Amino acid sequence: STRPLTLSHGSLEHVLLVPTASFFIASQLQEQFNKILPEPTEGFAADDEPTTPAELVGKFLGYVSSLVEPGQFDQVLNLCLTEFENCYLEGNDIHALAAKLLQENDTTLVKTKELIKNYITARIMAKRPFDKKSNSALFRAVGEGNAQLVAIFGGQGNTDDYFEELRDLYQTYHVLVGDLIKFSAETLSELIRTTLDAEKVFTQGL
DSSP states (O other): OEEEEEEEETTEEEEEEEEGGGHHHHHHHHHHHHHHSOOOOGGGOSTTSOSSHHHHHHHHHHHHHHHOOOOOSHHHHHHHHHHHHHHHOSSOOHHHHHHHHHHTSOOOHHHHHHHHHHHHHHHHHTTOOSOSOOOOHHHHHHHTTSOOOOOOOOOTTSOSOHHHHHHHHHHHTHHHHHHHHHHHHHHHHHHHHHSSSHHHHOTTOO
16 A cells, blocks of 8 residues: 655655555655755756756655665655656666756756765665666677777866866765775875875875
8 A cells, every 4th residue: 555745846746655654754754854945936946956856856865865874764765766766767877867857957067966966875875786787888888899998087287176076076976985085085194194295295284
């Protein structure tokens, strides 16, 4: 037995067919989620709000994932995450959907990045890593030999604001590259400490 749970932000709306066993926990999460959510505006042009039903559901996923601390809301997180995947990820990855919203729908870059963050954070938090091998067309072609891949890594002079790109990586993919960035920070600090004159070069620290 399952029943509808309607969540909307302005004209756009969505329905989760949650089971009756966790309907109460889902409903209270809905109530406090709507309380947290900012009020709708015409066109959804204001920042930090959804613009499409996909964006709204993904915001709810990210919010529930933040509230989850790896059992209280794990079942509802898994249920609504599966609903989101079934309705919007028709076998495709999150980034293809993100590009689709960016192109077809009136979605901004920050909203798309925040949707991606919410989905990935929910996926990792709900004991659902990406251990399953992906079926990307490019890598399938590589496996069958139809395409060849050469990685190229950039360097200096590409941009004057590379740190904003580091910041967007740490933000959007915090759960993924957080271990990498923490490891890099600690080893860089250790290298500065061990090096004789590194502190002099690093006036503002690292």
